[PDB]
Amino acid sequence: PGTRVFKKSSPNGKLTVYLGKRDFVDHLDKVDPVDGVVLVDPDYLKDRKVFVTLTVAFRYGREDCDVLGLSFRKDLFIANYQAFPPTPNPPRPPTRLQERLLRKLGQHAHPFFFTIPQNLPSSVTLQPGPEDTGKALGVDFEIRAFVAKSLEEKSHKRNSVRLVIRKVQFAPEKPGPQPSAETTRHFLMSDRSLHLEASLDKELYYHGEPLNVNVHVTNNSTKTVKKIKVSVRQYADIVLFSTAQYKVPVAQVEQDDQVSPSSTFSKVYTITPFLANNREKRGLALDGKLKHEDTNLASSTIVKEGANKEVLGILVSYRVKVKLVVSRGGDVSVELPFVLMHPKPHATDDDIVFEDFARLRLK
């Protein structure tokens, strides 16, 4: 009956930050507030002020001293809050968790409050390539706490404490409409055409759940289909100033099925995205990591019904492609959008330079 809490101490041991959670679920309309408590000894500083900062950054490069193009660190959101000396009571009152932490600690505890705006991306990370070293570009969240006489004062390693949090999303309860698509291709003069119908079973598939596609081919024409290919593609939409869409296949299934002219074909396939065979592909997007733990493929990013903003950070989306191989060109294909989420538990110069550099790298 005792809840857990996460804490991290300063290298000198004087400063410690208490956090009630590490994953802050987004509800598509509001974000769970970042409520915490900072413990500091007044006799230690006795003239400075305690500041806590929330930051989300589009970081590149590794964590330590890389020996190449280092961390382009465009910032998407910066917040500042003062713990000791205290500030006005809002917002709005102190929370229940803050009250319990104050009761557990005493007078030497000072709370802080942060409200994450809705217009922010989720924590993801591009998969590094074998030729590269360390990690690659990926947004992340961070909380810092330090003692200084002003906000512009330089950072101190002996007093500041750095903590890493995450922003996650979960599967909505309401099911979506049935995803289906069709595509017809006629010929030069004959009314004979090439009609195919493809559809999924659901909009939302949990991580690891197989995908069953329903493909119907109406080849009432003269040409012959040799191969059928079903692929699941991942779209990583890097957005800083100019949108860049990157395609990375994650699962492919091929069968040597022949479709005779003036005949139909029906079959149901089974394709499942997973990380075992995509451990060497550049440009793959994974879920944000805490320190170094293994993470699955990046969950789809779903936005509100009225799309006005959130063009920032990295956006992930999945689409299933079904392709028909036709002799002498005439390829016909369809794309079936779907989401992939976990179930709910119970004009700066160097910025343009970096954008061009990333575009040249991944493309």
Epitope: G208, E209, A276, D294, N296
Partner: antibody, heavy 119, light 109 residues
């Protein structure tokens, strides 16, 4: 959901034996299939595990280099291969199952196949 | 190294309707990765508690777990006449996972 397994019996010491666990009712990518053996009259013991999603296999220190675990995703089965069987390798082998996202204990078990080695 | 999971007592005797307490000791600190299984003689184990505090689905509410540092405890409020089996303590935070030594619960006369 059912965890049916077979393939045990009597194997001469130093021989080889192959155990199969035909999982049913769930998926091999969303679950991690573990193997647990129980010595007669003793407690449980962990020997091997496989994670089809990440392609990761782990083994116990007492069975490292002798036991090889593999799975066939198409048939939704897990295979444990025994090599260089010794008198300490006789037990009843179970086929557990734990959620991949995320681990919450071995909530599903098989029925156990008896394995003995004797000259 | 390997985390030894010392479980005591080895065997305890209790009567119907009494309270049964089993303690599990971890040599190294595991946060909450403790699971409690129940194995009747001749059958396969059955998960009862996961995360050292949560009750598994389809399990009577008399079973309950708790954590205190590295001391994990399984408590049964009312000992049902069919709850006489062997209980194990398993940790799954560090590979390899290590089980306990068992705690046989028998009727008292």
């Amino acid at each position: 959901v059912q965890l049916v397994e077979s393939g045990g019996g009597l194997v001469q010491p130093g021989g080889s034996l192959r155990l199969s666990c035909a999982a049913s009712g769930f998926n091999v990518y969303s679950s991690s299939i573990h193997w647990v053996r129980q010595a007669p009259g003793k407690g449980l013991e962990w020997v091997a595990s496989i994670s089809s999603y990440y392609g990761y296999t782990y083994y116990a220190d007492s069975v490292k280099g002798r036991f090889t675990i593999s799975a066939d995703t198409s048939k939704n089965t897990a295979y444990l291969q025994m090599n260089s069987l010794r008198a300490e390798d006789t037990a009843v082998y179970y086929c557990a199952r734990s959620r991949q996202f995320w681990y919450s204990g071995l909530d599903y078990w098989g029925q156990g196949t008896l394995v003995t080695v004797s000259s | 190294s390997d985390i030894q999971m010392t479980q005591s007592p080895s065997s305890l005797s209790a009567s119907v309707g009494d309270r049964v307490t089993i303690t599990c000791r971890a040599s190294q600190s595991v946060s909450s990765a403790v699971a409690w299984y129940q194995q009747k003689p001749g059958k396969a184990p059955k998960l009862l508690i996961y995360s050292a505090s949560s009750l598994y689905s389809g399990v009577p509410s008399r079973f309950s777990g708790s954590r205190s540092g590295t001391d994990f405890t399984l408590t049964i409020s009312s000992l049902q006449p069919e709850d006489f089996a062997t209980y194990y303590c398993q940790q799954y935070k560090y590979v390899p996972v290590t089980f306990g030594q068992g705690t046989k619960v028998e009727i008292k006369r």
